């Protein structure tokens, strides 16, 4: 209990397509973060952190849910 950083080091404040997303991850304020952070698996291989502060994020993410649900 000394110093803990949020899961998302930074957020990718740049629009891109939902086509690349296969897995979604949402972590609510934890013992390391006093807020909320959206995370996503990047089909390139890595992971990526999105900022719910952007409208395009609420959209590409919304489509993922509507797509994984309709599937």
């Amino acid at each position: 209990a000394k110093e803990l950083r949020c899961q998302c080091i930074k957020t990718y404040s740049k629009p891109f397509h939902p086509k690349f997303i296969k897995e979604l991850r949402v972590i609510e304020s934890g013992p390391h973060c006093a807020n909320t952070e959206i995370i996503v698996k990047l089909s390139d291989g890595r992971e990526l952190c999105l900022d719910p502060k952007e409208n395009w994020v609420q959209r590409v993410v919304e489509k993922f849910l509507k797509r994984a649900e309709n599937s």
């Binding site: 899961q7 998302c8 080091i9 930074k10 957020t11 990718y12 740049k14 891109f16 397509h17 086509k19 690349f20 991850r25 972590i27 952070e37 995370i39 990047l42 089909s43 390139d44 291989g45 890595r46 992971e47 990526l48 952190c49």
Partner: peptide, 16 residues
Amino acid sequence: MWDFDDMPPADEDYSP
């Protein structure tokens, strides 16, 4: 890298 389309990050410090 080829996963993209002419596009995800061209930078990477987003590793939770």
